[PDB]
Symmetry: C3
Subunit: 70 residues, 3 copies
């Protein structure tokens, strides 16, 4: 039971990690399309993207560190 | 250590919350680019809202139960 | 801290991840639709990598489902 729960936590984190890598790709796609515009809130959007990207990366790192905190 | 397992459940949830914020930022980005146009987009709005409502419900459920732990 | 409580919540986290995955696939649809308007380069490789990780997380989701049943 205890090992199964831990194993499930490990599985969930990996799904989250894979979700994030999948998020990184979607962000690239939007920024690539936005770069075509030569002629509106993107500068604030850019900062929020950087904001939550870092926050997620820390939470993933924190989750990884928790695996050895027993 | 069952003090870490509760903590790890909290960590995953927070990561999920933050990834939901990032997802919503991507939705805004798509809608911005889409607004520069002029099928699908009306239905796309409906399904974006639908699953956003579904995620927000599951997060609330997970948050409350995180406290019961 | 009942073990059934953690297991219960792990089910929700999994359901949340599954729902967020469906939301993400809806965003991929939106991007590809806008990208299709380009007639002028990363996008062929972008498709390959969206494809690669979509399958990868789906494996992890399926693996999480079968673990959830073993709990």
């Amino acid at each position: 039971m205890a090992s199964g729960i831990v194993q499930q936590q490990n599985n969930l984190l990996r799904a989250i990690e894979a979700q994030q890598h999948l998020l990184q790709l979607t962000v690239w796609g939007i920024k690539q399309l936005q770069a075509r515009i030569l002629s509106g809130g993107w500068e604030e959007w850019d900062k929020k993207i950087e904001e939550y990207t870092k926050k997620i990366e820390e939470l993933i790192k924190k989750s990884q560190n928790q695996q050895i905190d027993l």
